[PDB]
A paper describes a structure:
Protein arginine methyltransferases (PRMTs) methylate arginine residues in histone and non-histone proteins in a mono, and symmetric or asymmetric dimethyl manner. PRMT7 is a monomethyl arginine methyltransferase that has a role in muscle physiology and stem cell biology. PRMT7, a member of the PRMT family, has been functionally implicated in a wide range of cellular processes including DNA damage signaling, imprinting, and regulation of pluripotency. PRMT enzymes display methylation preference for RGG/RG motifs enriched at protein–protein interfaces, whereas PRMT7 has been reported to target RXR motifs in arginine and lysine-rich regions.
Human PRMT7 shares 93% sequence identity with Mus musculus PRMT7 (MmPRMT7), and the key residues involved in SAM and substrate-binding sites are conserved between the two species. To provide further insight into the mechanism of action of SGC8158, we solved the crystal structure of full-length MmPRMT7 in complex with SGC8158 refined to 2.4 Å resolution (referred to here as MmPRMT7_SGC8158). The structure showed that SGC8158, interacted only with the catalytically active N-terminal methyltransferase domain of PRMT7 in MmPRMT7_SGC8158. Clear electron density was observed for the ribosyl and biphenylmethylamine moieties of SGC8158. The biphenylmethylamine moiety of SGC8158 extends toward the conserved THW loop region (residues Arg311 to Met315) and displaces the Trp314 side chain, to occupy a hydrophobic pocket composed of Trp282, Phe146, Tyr48, Met296, Arg44, and Arg311 side chains, and forms an edge-to-face π-stacking interaction with Trp282. The PRMT-conserved THW loop is part of the active-site pocket and involved in substrate binding, but interestingly SGC8158 did not affect the peptide substrate binding. SGC8158 is a structural derivative of SAM, acts as a SAM-competitive inhibitor of PRMT7, and occupies the adenosine pocket in the SAM-binding site of PRMT7. With increasing concentrations of SAM in the presence of a constant peptide concentration, we observed higher IC50 values, which indicated a SAM-competitive pattern of inhibition.
Numbering used by the authors: 34 to 312, 315 to 353, 361 to 546, 558 to 631, 638 to 653, 666 to 688
Write the structure that this text describes.
Amino acid sequence: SYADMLHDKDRNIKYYQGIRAAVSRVKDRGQKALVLDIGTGTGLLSMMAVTAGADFCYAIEVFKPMAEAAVKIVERNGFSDKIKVINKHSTEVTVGPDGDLPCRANILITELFDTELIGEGALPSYEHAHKHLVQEDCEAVPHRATVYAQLVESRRMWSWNKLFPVRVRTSLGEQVIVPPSELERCPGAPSVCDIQLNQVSPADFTVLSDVLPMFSVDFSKQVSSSAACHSRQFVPLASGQAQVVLSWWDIEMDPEGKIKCTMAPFWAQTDPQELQWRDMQCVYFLPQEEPVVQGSPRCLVAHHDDYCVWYSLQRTSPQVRPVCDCQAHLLWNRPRFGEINDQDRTDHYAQALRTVLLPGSVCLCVSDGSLLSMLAHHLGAEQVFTVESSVASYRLMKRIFKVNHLEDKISVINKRPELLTAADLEGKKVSLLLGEPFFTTSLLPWHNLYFWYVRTSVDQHLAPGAVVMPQAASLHAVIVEFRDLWRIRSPCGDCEGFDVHIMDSREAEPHPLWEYPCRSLSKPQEILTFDFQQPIPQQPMQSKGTMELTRPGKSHGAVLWMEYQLTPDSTISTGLINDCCWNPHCKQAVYFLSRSVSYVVEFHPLTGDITMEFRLA
Ligand SMILES: Nc1ncnc2c1ncn2[C@@H]1O[C@H](CSCCCCNCc2cccc(-c3ccc(Cl)cc3)c2)[C@@H](O)[C@H]1O
Ligand SMILES: [Zn+2]
């Protein structure tokens, strides 16, 4: 997490300018400059405050390992005389004879901000600090933040929050899978969706409002963690369906507002060429979509408690954070909603099924919260068994079956799919085991090989000449140059003249690369192939190999992903779709390196784990 904090020169330079100005304001009134730095991490901002002329710094860090690093970094840079590191939560910190501080500080520095601004406890930390740790009449860096909101319509972003009608073409015309009405009514998951709006095509949404300033936090004055709401009257820039609130904040480092960072996306700033990349923006969903009309004014309401923000449109006439009362939002993350609502993807799976559905086939469907079972039945399966391994998921799938009048056409088995019995299949044999494959708990692409393990575990229940779908799957890699993402894992070593070197097999990281532009240096190479049609070989699959770097640029990482061979005539990619183009529904794995790259990759059968190394050569 704290590798990103150092690579952000714009953040560091602005904190440094704020700290110089805030220490000078205090020294110039003839006063002792006493710094309280809540969330010191490395101590960088405490080291800045001393170079600026602060008399002492009290640097608070709750995470022991970081506290201990901060102690060593302060010593190496020569600041131990003027910086005391305290390993506690700021709310446990006291002023007194047996206290952490001898007296209240008069310069308050923090970096307790996430994408939502208040999600890392800034409101309660600042509250406790003004109450107990800081003088009235005190400098704060940052001085003030402001949260902005922009109302939009976005089929694509609304497809992260709602189940749409799903179409399949049967022999006897086109069929429609409709969503349970309670989904349509749900406010959705009571949590922010944090995205790089800079990578959203301006075609994917229509702006309905100006950028509205919704509220400000003044860090120099007493701050409340109390629930509040802020209403802004606005004039719709156009007519359409109010669906999504795009949000971001800016900070001012000084009382005059001269020193400023903003998280604003490209289209809300004056010059795209002056943009400074961040490791971003918020996407919220209105609890109901509703039409707005050009010229015809409405009131957008920002709500917040001590950690959470949420949005409503005030009724024309005319508060707990609403929660999911439909189940779906607790089982399906935003990407998964988007994935299920991709009609081209459903069409591609439909055509795969028309192929491998021999007359009177007996389908077992394996994949969490999957619509394949409904497609299978609509396309002429004799009988459909499906596995849902949680009660919540069992109940949601039964609910979707019921409202589509298929409650007696599809059997849900509520077990771990590998532990399935002959009686769960009503003594019938499976002619067609099928899946996406998708499982809720899969973090890396190959975790979905759990499908293959299940296929192995249930061999004895498969009819002779049983077809599997996917029939096979392959691990693919490509070496890439990242526009920006390298900074997430690239040691700083020197940070504004301060030495943080003490801060600066390898597990591949999952990342939604549709949000992180990059270009291919190698050609894409198939690394391992998995034959689902057969059991898992109980001996590890290895594969040494070479990838020739054919266009120039810093070889930043190997991007790994799955492809699934559905039928012989049909394949689908969770990685490259044809700057690299990435399937926006799945996370790809990145191996960070640290005229050719060489690899050892090994798949382990007892686990599904894959160990790998990528060395330049
Ligand atoms: N109350 C606490 N007391 C003591 N330690 C405490 C307390 N809370 C927390 N921590 C510690 O503070 C430390 C920090 S937390 C927060 C985790 C990192 C979040 N940045 C990531 C990020 C994303 C997006 C934007 C920005 C950004 C951009 C510009 C500007 Cl100008 C300012 C910020 C930053 C950790 O080391 C915690 O362990
Ligand atoms: Zn819900």
